[PDB]
């Protein structure tokens, strides 16, 4: 066996339909992220200086892995923007934040 430095913590921040990150590295590290659908997106890249990067996150779930840590899974919750009762101008756009194709 052998010992490993364990780069510091990454704190997360939320936004509607996507979660963003912030990082503070001492000396270089790695990221990666999957998507738990049927076809992933699997981008990954080395970082050296402190920046921020964004992920997407669907209604099926994604997960990242920062450094020498066991991974953290992260889903997304069903949220809208309007009401759910009242004048019919409002009800139609209430669905538009949910199934915006159909």
């Amino acid at each position: 066996t052998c010992r490993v430095p364990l780069a510091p913590e990454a704190l997360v921040r939320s936004g509607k339909r996507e979660a963003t990150l912030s990082l503070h590295p001492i000396h270089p590290t790695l990221l990666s992220y999957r998507t738990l659908g049927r076809e992933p997106v699997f981008d990954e890249q080395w970082i050296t200086t402190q920046t921020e990067v964004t992920i997407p996150v669907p209604v099926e779930g994604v997960e990242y892995r920062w450094g020498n840590h066991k991974p953290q899974r992260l889903w997304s919750q069903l949220t809208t923007e309007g009401r759910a009762h009242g004048w019919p101008h409002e009800i139609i756009e209430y669905y538009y934040g949910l199934h915006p194709t159909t």
């Binding site: 936004g15 979660a19 999957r34 699997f42 889903w75 759910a84 009762h85 009800i91």
Partner: protein
């Protein structure tokens, strides 16, 4: 009594089903999976490892020419060079100056670290999978491991479970994989004995003991220097240790469904697709007949609070007149909202939790053999990111009587109406114009 059901293959998720026998009280089972392996079948085809050369001590004899002999070993090449005049440490070596000749040979063998470090190829076929299921009911918590091809029974206290074969048996592998130390790749490797120099598969062997090689790295022998003693040597550099720095991204990062790998035997765990069927042979000493079955009537259900959301965020109370204490069983007979607790308590009022991903649900619930309904209207939560998933089916469809589409029948009936005065006022003169 025997029964059949289907359960969804996703870790940490409740599902529940009945029997309703006759005469006796009902009985509700719940089924919940905790682990799901997967395992293919393999057969080895070759290996590869790093190699090393040998140049054993070249031969000089002077004023007498040469001849070297052939011998069996992979990639043996001998040569013969005329007109050499060395000059060793002490002085000049020997003096038969014009007619001197010198030979050289070398060969290739495997290194000393192959029996700890190698990278083997394989081949895949049809695969089988096995699960671990926690099943509970009555007065008993139990768990049970099981094969999923439909032949393997298992015994609880008197009962038999046999599981349906599969929905479908695809895999996250194709026919050729290559395994090196804790992660699996997805290559297309050369067949046998056709490895052109430099790339992967430059040294082959079957099962890793000895006696057979294949090696084509292009050895050539060159002319030695003017007045020294060494052996020159030329070679395209090795093929294994030019692969393990400029490689690819592995398969532990592009796996399709969260399907994670670890492999002294190759596996693929917690892989979340589809449905698995189940069938049931139930014993008889796990019911209640009628004696401690309480009689419950005039059931009336209301509601107070809901969200969508992702956990048990709907609460309801129940009202009923009792005659005897005991313990009844609860269920909601539709796919739009699943309950939480498996057995209500006796006399009084009692509450039940549920979850539903829709705007306005309506379903029918039945603590014991009498039935009732209760509906509600709902509103979204103020959040965007949760840490724990999916405690509902995932069906967000409209009801048959909501605030939303009570608007619908008025418009469609309204547009259905104004043609109806138009249709007959056509006809009422259409007769009289045949006067």
């Amino acid at each position: 009594y025997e029964h059949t059901a289907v359960i969804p293959n996703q870790v940490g998720f409740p599902y529940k089903a009945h029997v309703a026998r006759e005469g006796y009280s009902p009985l509700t089972l719940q089924m919940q999976v905790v682990e799901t392996s997967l395992e293919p079948t393999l057969n080895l085809e070759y290996i590869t490892c790093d190699y090393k050369t040998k140049v054993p001590s070249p031969y000089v004899k002077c004023c007498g020419t040469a001849e070297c002999r052939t011998q069996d070993k992979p990639e043996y090449k001998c040569a013969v060079f005329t007109g050499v005049y060395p000059f060793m440490w002490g002085g000049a070596y020997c003096f038969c100056d014009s007619e001197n000749t010198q030979m050289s040979e070398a060969y290739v063998e495997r290194a000393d670290v192959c029996k700890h470090d190698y990278a083997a190829a394989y081949r895949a076929h049809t695969a089988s999978l096995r699960a671990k299921i926690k099943v509970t009911y009555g007065t008993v918590n139990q768990t049970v491991e099981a094969y999923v091809n439909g032949d393997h029974a298992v015994t609880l206290a008197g009962t038999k479970f046999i599981f349906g074969p599969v929905s479908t048996a695809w895999t996250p592998f194709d026919t050729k994989i290559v395994v090196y130390k804790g992660e699996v790749y997805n290559q297309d490797f050369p067949p046998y004995g056709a490895g052109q120099p430099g790339r992967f598969g430059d040294i082959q062997s079957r099962t890793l003991d000895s006696k057979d090689l294949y090696a084509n790295t292009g050895l050539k022998l060159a002319r030695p220097a003017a007045g020294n003693i060494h052996v020159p040597y030329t070679q395209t550099p090795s093929g294994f240790k030019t692969w393990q720095k400029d490689r690819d991204s592995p398969l532990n990062a592009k796996a399709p469904f969260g399907c994670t790998i670890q492999t002294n035997p190759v596996r693929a765990m917690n892989c979340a697709v589809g449905n698995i069927p189940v069938s049931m042979d139930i014993a008889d000493s796990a019911f209640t007949r009628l004696t401690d079955a309480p009689i419950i009537s005039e059931l009336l259900c209301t509601v107070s609070t809901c969200t969508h959301s992702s956990d048990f965020g709907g609460v309801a109370v129940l009202s009923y007149k009792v005659e005897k204490a005991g313990r009844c069983d609860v269920h909601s007979h539709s796919n739009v909202a699943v309950l939480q607790e498996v057995s209500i308590e006796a006399e009084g009022r009692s509450v039940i939790h549920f979850s539903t991903a829709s705007a306005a649900p309506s379903f029918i619930v039945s603590v014991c053999s009498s039935r009732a309904t209760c509906t509600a209207k709902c509103e979204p939560p103020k959040d965007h990111v949760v840490t724990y998933p999916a405690n509902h089916n995932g069906i967000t469809l409209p009801d048959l009587s909501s605030t939303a589409m009570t608007w619908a029948q008025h418009l469609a009936g309204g547009v259905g109406l104004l043609i109806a005065l138009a249709v007959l006022i056509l006809v009422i003169v259409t007769c009289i114009t045949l006067r």
